[PDB]
Design a protein around this motif. Structure first.
Motif, PDB file in Angstrom:
ATOM      1  N   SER A 109     -28.026 -22.894 -43.275  1.00  0.00           N
ATOM      2  CA  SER A 109     -27.789 -21.455 -43.235  1.00  0.00           C
ATOM      3  C   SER A 109     -28.883 -20.613 -43.863  1.00  0.00           C
ATOM      4  N   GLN A 152     -25.499 -31.578 -37.701  1.00  0.00           N
ATOM      5  CA  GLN A 152     -24.555 -31.101 -38.722  1.00  0.00           C
ATOM      6  C   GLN A 152     -23.108 -31.220 -38.242  1.00  0.00           C
ATOM      7  N   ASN A 173     -20.095 -33.141 -39.767  1.00  0.00           N
ATOM      8  CA  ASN A 173     -18.898 -32.362 -40.034  1.00  0.00           C
ATOM      9  C   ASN A 173     -17.680 -33.096 -39.517  1.00  0.00           C
ATOM     10  N   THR A 209     -14.361 -25.208 -50.079  1.00  0.00           N
ATOM     11  CA  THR A 209     -15.810 -25.038 -50.121  1.00  0.00           C
ATOM     12  C   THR A 209     -16.302 -23.611 -49.965  1.00  0.00           C
ATOM     13  N   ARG A 229     -16.504 -15.007 -35.614  1.00  0.00           N
ATOM     14  CA  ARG A 229     -16.311 -16.387 -36.043  1.00  0.00           C
ATOM     15  C   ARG A 229     -15.053 -16.952 -35.399  1.00  0.00           C
ATOM     16  N   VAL A 260      -9.621 -18.499 -45.169  1.00  0.00           N
ATOM     17  CA  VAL A 260     -10.901 -18.435 -44.483  1.00  0.00           C
ATOM     18  C   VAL A 260     -11.212 -16.994 -44.071  1.00  0.00           C
ATOM     19  N   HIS A 284     -16.860 -24.835 -43.827  1.00  0.00           N
ATOM     20  CA  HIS A 284     -18.275 -24.485 -43.838  1.00  0.00           C
ATOM     21  C   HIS A 284     -19.010 -24.947 -42.559  1.00  0.00           C
ATOM     22  N   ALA A 285     -18.304 -25.653 -41.676  1.00  0.00           N
ATOM     23  CA  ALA A 285     -18.886 -26.211 -40.451  1.00  0.00           C
ATOM     24  C   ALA A 285     -19.723 -25.302 -39.544  1.00  0.00           C
ATOM     25  N   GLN A 338     -22.974 -23.815 -39.588  1.00  0.00           N
ATOM     26  CA  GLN A 338     -23.443 -22.561 -40.156  1.00  0.00           C
ATOM     27  C   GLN A 338     -22.348 -21.546 -40.465  1.00  0.00           C
ATOM     28  N   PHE A 339     -21.161 -22.046 -40.791  1.00  0.00           N
ATOM     29  CA  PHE A 339     -20.034 -21.191 -41.127  1.00  0.00           C
ATOM     30  C   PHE A 339     -19.440 -20.435 -39.954  1.00  0.00           C
ATOM     31  N   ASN A 340     -19.893 -20.729 -38.742  1.00  0.00           N
ATOM     32  CA  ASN A 340     -19.370 -20.025 -37.580  1.00  0.00           C
ATOM     33  C   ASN A 340     -18.057 -20.631 -37.124  1.00  0.00           C
ATOM     34  N   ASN A 381     -15.619 -21.729 -38.969  1.00  0.00           N
ATOM     35  CA  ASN A 381     -14.878 -21.731 -40.215  1.00  0.00           C
ATOM     36  C   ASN A 381     -13.479 -22.331 -40.023  1.00  0.00           C
TER      37      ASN A 381
END
Lengths: 510, 510, 510, 510
Positions: free
Chosen positions: A339, A366, A370, B389, C257, C332, D390-391, D393-395, D397
């Motif tokens: 990120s 990633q 994950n 997290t 998101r 979240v 957090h998966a 790049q947090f997109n 979520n």
């Protein structure tokens, strides 16, 4: 380079070499010991002199192997079975099992000849059934007992022939002595602890790389801090991190997230837990677990239960739980790396060739990690607490679940070996891209701390990427199959390759 | 009988007395120490001399308490909060927190005056929010901060008045020094470990009674056996059992199920695990956990993270897991007792007056324990692995969950105290009925081993049943409310009554 | 407004009103029904005519209550016990239990008089012990049976006097008819499902607010999408979200998101799971669960096991698991809100008065929710799989764990009520601060979708914050005690206040 | 016997035949449908006419496959991948994906030609990476993409050649259309549900045999009982049991433990849960999950998230949980069988030849099942609740964990297939020994209910034991390898052999 059983207590490292590396075994020649083994047998023999007939009591020992041949599921790894054998032998050497040295030798022979009886993963509640397979093979009882003779499948009878060995007939106590114990689950266990200590070290190396790719401070690991909260595990981790970052140019010298600032405090309990485990497994490894136990010194036998592998079931449960913690902490590091908002300037997803717009970098790698990390936490659930109270006609109203629990921890280590490969890959790419952002070239070796340089180069060697200041590990997306590099680094770590040797200095620090 | 903080490292037993028994506290007068506390403060003061304004930096410390006043759920136990305070104080005594001795004293005052600030069970991820409540109270910041003044609810401002104390104003670093740390979760923890060590001992006593009610052998605990599998935990348990059964007439002298024959091997890991925990909690208890840390000797401060209570979260997880194991092993004993097929002659469900046919005995009491034991295993699940997290704007990408994990272990201990009551009841009834089957009378004291006699009588005293050879503990079903005896034995165990004193000899053996 | 038992099948909503709201009960006057109840009793009576003596068989029924009085732990909620009673009655109305209408009436009397027998949380494996407490009270068997007479503690004997009722004596089958069943765990359950459906709706409202505070699109909820993946749960959620955002000015009209874009798909299984549960609980609620069952139509009784509350144990397990999912999804959302990098322009931690630099905003409130959410997932673990196979002399080798599992789900709902309070608070602050960023004032009502305006205002009313364009919900940190607003919103939600009424339109949509 | 995609919604049974049995596929010729597929593509094409260049947008689709080639771990089963393909195709047929019929055909070709691309078990969080492997193969993008051509390993490029197919080049939207979705996890899932429904039926058969071996009553399954507690699942189970025991001579006609008396009530929720799952999986199976979705009718595309396989992750979690319940209930039956105290007269451990004293019977087989059952409950833990926030790049979520959760359920089914083998073996031996105790001969067929006779004989056929009144299934311990019979019955059940056909009548009853 030869391992001698009977004189000194076996260590985890000893069992691994013999099981994984094929090392040679030799039973000590100490008269004291051999006399103890012979003394315990006469006690049994003399018990038949007075009074249950020799012939009936030997048929009993033999029919035991037969009803116990009900294993199911996949087969254990040849190294797991080899370690079990080694431990079985080592056990009968204290000479309290009343078993014939000739049998204690049949193992040495199989171990040095590369013969490994086949064993199923299912069958023990915590190791009668599994040991019944090892036993049946040793004595060549029947062809149904298959084995692995240096490469291909043979039956026990054929193996004994080729070994110039004569089938054997179980004596009075010998069946129970062979098949009553915790040698197989404790053998599977010794192998996991080992692997775990390895992955741990590598884990320490991966954070080292990560911290440098993030340009994080090393102040977090200053001794004062950890001498104010002197947990030996924390003390050790901070110290090993301070050194792993020694003379580093990619780390700022003196803001950082907790995954970096609290790293020692977090890793601490796991480092301490893993040493506790190790110590407890070594004690199981050098214990007598068959029954009853023959006390020659007082001419009397006792009926107890050192065959409950409670320490192995409890211990393996914890270990899977520490693995899950380690991995989830690692996944959080990767998260920051990928990120731009948190990586401190790194390209999004550690993309290499920004020139080409189609390049996405390690975004797919990633997602792959994950999907593995959660599974590791999933395997962090326990099994020792789920033991069946109705087991074996209600006589085994309590049991350890040591055997399956051990197998479960083996499945974790295996997956975590895959996971570490993915992590190592992220850190190698990160330090390259960090170097370029600071120096203008992709030769991380010119800036990495000497201690992490070894690991760094060990991974590039394994994946086949040649050190050059003109390009980073991953440049374009169409130039390599990430899956190939995962498998290669895994196999390396699993076989104890260059990458492992690179962390030699950390594994021995424990 | 006075506890002095600062000179020697606090032990679990010290924290319990002060928290549970109201023991008095006294800060050591050692000049070296007091000088270290004063030295760390000048460092901060001198930091304002050079350069962030005194007034702004004090408002910051004060506004900190305000946004942190967001606790929710039920309130912690007064003893948990008292232990937290004691630990906070003890911490600032190493003199690396840069806090005013006057504050390190405000605690001593509250502790000795019986003032306990109110604290919520929810709010920490592992103790800012909770400590913010303790802090706000100490300095009388506002009336919204309620406390417990020896019996009734007062507000902090009123409490300070009645204590003849002047509200205080947080200085430069003092806010972080107060509210940054692991004192509350580590205080809740010290109390659990203690209670756990108690229940453990009692557990050992309950099996002792059970084994005698079952007429089981003591051979299972012969040293030879356990010296062949020398796990220090197993060694200890077998030994304590051999002694607990000393000169017993209800046990056969020399077939037994595993719950009896493998008892030591089973209990072993739990006994060892509980000592490991204890040792680790004591180290947290005597650590400096606020931040940053002031190193007066080198005139420099460090920014690290000794505020992560990883050892407490991991440690409490394990403890709940051991509790669940202990209890399920106990439930299996009861199972044998209640069943004529397995109890070796005892009446079904330990019924007392077979004359009356309506009597069912302890069948209802077993179902009650059957509903508690599973819950204990349920609480044996972990929480440290489920940390969020994304916490606190992603800055706390890793956290210990120590606080809730600690509270969870407190809920287990509480339930397990109820469970032990039910077990104790079963063993008292069993030995009576075993005595009668062997001797013809219900006076178990005439046959019980001296070591279990103390516990035996301690329980009858608590329930109010008078020793007589003419009747057993439970005779008819309509003669007592079993629920009353459960509650009475629970309260006793929880307050440290006669029953606990009865196991004094085992708790200190650890 | 009166609930009549016996004619139509009870619904969850019916049980709640009677249990929570004190609603009045009335047994139908239908001759058919009353005749069925009387018919089943004569069958039993006639069984004594032919042949086990009336006096012995009644003493048996009475001694049953006595050995079953072994409950432990805290007491159930008065509403849980009231619901149990209601269900017990409702059950005996099918007239297959062979019980006296006079007893089926003793309940109606206690329910309408506000008498609630005391019941312990521990004692059932899935409800003999618990029902034994309700029974003992009803018939005034003894003073040890305490109850709650509209406010204070009385004993059953005294309560019957004041009710002008004559103690009763259990007839042939009546004990089993009363104490054999799943009425208490199914009553505790009906109350949870209800509360759960409420929190769910509120959950839907909280995301609505969140999505507007984030300025997210509503395109994600367009029907086409969800008509291509027609899961009825997803279909329902998308639709309810499309409407909840109707004519909104804070949402962009048409990047987001997954917590927003996949909201329907995520919530879907939970919405469907919760309806499945509801339906299954209603069926338990209207079942006959005592034993044996009297089939008057064929003059014969059967001995089966409709007393196993498997559906309740399995059902409650799932429910805790859905609660944990809902909450983690909410956490979240908050995460995005508090982070300037992800909130789309909102102040960090939704701080209100940026003028004052000490203000930290809801950073403490997030940490508080960060400590609750994991606990909810922790409670998401199951219990039905951990049933003890050795239970009750091995006769109950299988059991549901329904009772404790039910209590566990009650502990979750309670915590999740606290959690929702924290979430609601975040969304109210978010839409205010979003409004100001777009319009220049803090009057969210001028821009919120009408459907979320009701909920919005309902929360401000409850916390006591007055709608004004000059200031947002939280301005300065020292101007309010966040803990007070948590407790107030909780109590509101728990009592069915304004906030709940605000989601009326969503709860009924299910 | 040919499966046609596009016209009617696919059912689980359809996917199984095509995946497991190699059944042929044929895309419907319906002009309406084909026109919808062509219509959606023109929409994309027309989007390039107006305005992101055709060449750049095609390179993007192709580079997508490249960075996504990061799978790890073992390979999926060829049937799992075949089912995925079938579902991918079926999806693009609703014509909302804007993909070329030529590609929708490349699948039909691979399916009918027996080509199966290789896919890793790790890589998806819930199926980009996995589908990227299927895609790469289909279009012959590179040799690194291996496949399975009817028996041996070939590379995709070579496979396309031998199929006389021309490598393809991904068009505008086609990459996302191929690799965005839930086809692989939903394909793995359909196969599990199927297998689960099978094992369930067999489960019903195993209890039938058990109940007869125990001489238990059939009264427990009388309709009246279950019509008083009308849970459709319970209703179904009782009924299927009443019939399975029809005209039985080994069952008493009209005391029994709960595992027999509450069997329907226990199995009920599992039977209902499994139907709910099935229904939900079929809906995923016939959904469009790629993105964005093309709405040709209104000339507009939407960006949503039907790619979240929440229903699969939640659904598979539950399924593993039901498997664990089923198995533990079975283990309890076996427990009664092996124990003379509870088996109602059967020999201890179902020993066959009491003449020979060394014979121990199935005691080893029970210990083996005792080690498997706990593992099944262990796998009953969930994974959907452990998703990483957090998966990517947090997109992402929020994510379903559907893929691994699916794989986990596959590991359970596999183990439970082994477990069922062990159970079947116990029931066959039990009814033989029950017959002999009643009639004097070991020909169970003369007394078994006709419905269980089919299953009975199906198992003897598979193990190779010939029906004879002179001997039971297991006579002496040295006459057979129990492990061989386990493996044989497993393979049979897994391939759908005689044993499965024997339960045909129960699987279709659902």
């Amino acid at each position: 380079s030869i391992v001698t059983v009977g004189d000194r207590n076996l260590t985890i490292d000893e069992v691994v070499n013999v099981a994984r590396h094929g090392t040679q075994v030799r039973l000590t020649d100490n008269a004291d010991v051999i006399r103890g083994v012979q003394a315990s047998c006469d006690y049994i023999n003399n018990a038949v002199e007075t009074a249950i007939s020799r012939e009936q009591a030997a048929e009993l020992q033999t029919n035991l192997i037969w009803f116990l041949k009900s294993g199911a599921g996949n087969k254990l790894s040849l190294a797991d079975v080899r370690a079990a054998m080694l431990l079985r032998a080592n056990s009968h050497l204290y000479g309290a099992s009343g078993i014939r040295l000739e049998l204690i030798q049949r193992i040495e022979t199989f171990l040095n000849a590369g013969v490994t009886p086949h064993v199923y993963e299912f069958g023990s509640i915590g190791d009668l059934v599994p040991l019944s397979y090892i036993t049946g093979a040793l004595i060549g009882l029947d062809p149904s007992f298959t084995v692995d003779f240096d490469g291909k499948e043979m039956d026990a009878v054929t193996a004994l022939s080729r070994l110039g060995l004569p089938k054997l007939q179980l004596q009075p106590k010998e069946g129970l002595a062979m098949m009553n114990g915790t040698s197989v689950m404790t053998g599977i266990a010794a192998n996991c602890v080992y692997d775990a200590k390895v992955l741990l070290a590598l884990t320490m190396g991966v954070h080292a790389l990560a911290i440098q790719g993030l340009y994080g401070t090393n102040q977090s690991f200053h001794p004062f801090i950890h001498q104010c909260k002197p947990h030996p595990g924390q003390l050790w981790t901070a110290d090993q991190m301070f050194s792993l970052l020694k003379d580093s140019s990619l780390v700022r010298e003196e803001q950082d997230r907790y995954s970096l600032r609290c790293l020692a405090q977090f890793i601490g309990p796991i480092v301490d837990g893993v040493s506790e485990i190790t110590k407890q497994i070594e004690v199981e490894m050098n214990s007598v677990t068959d029954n009853p136990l023959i006390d020659v010194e007082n001419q009397v036998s006792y009926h107890g239960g050192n065959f409950l592998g409670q320490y192995v079931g409890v211990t393996m449960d914890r270990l899977r739980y520490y693995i899950g913690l380690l991995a989830k902490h690692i996944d959080v590091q990767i998260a920051l790396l990928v990120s731009p908002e948190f990586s401190n300037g790194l390209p999004p997803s550690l993309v290499g060739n920004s020139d080409r717009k189609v390049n996405m970098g390690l975004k797919g790698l990633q997602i792959s990690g994950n999907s593995i990390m959660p599974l590791l936490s999933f395997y962090g659930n326990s099994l020792a607490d789920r033991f069946p109270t109705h087991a074996e006609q209600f006589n085994q109203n309590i049991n350890s679940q040591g055997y399956i629990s051990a197998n479960l921890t083996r499945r974790s280590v295996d997956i975590f070996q895959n996971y570490m490969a993915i992590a190592l890959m992220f850190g190698v790419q990160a330090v390259d891209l960090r170097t370029y952002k600071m120096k203008g070239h992709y030769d991380a070796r010119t800036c990495l701390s000497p201690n992490t340089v070894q690991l760094y180069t060990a991974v590039c060697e394994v994946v086949g990427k040649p050190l050059t200041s003109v390009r980073p590990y991953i440049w374009n997306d169409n130039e390599q199959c990430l899956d190939e590099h995962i498998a290669r680094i895994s196999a390396d770590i699993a076989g104890g390759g260059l990458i492992v040797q690179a962390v030699e200095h950390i594994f021995s620090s424990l």
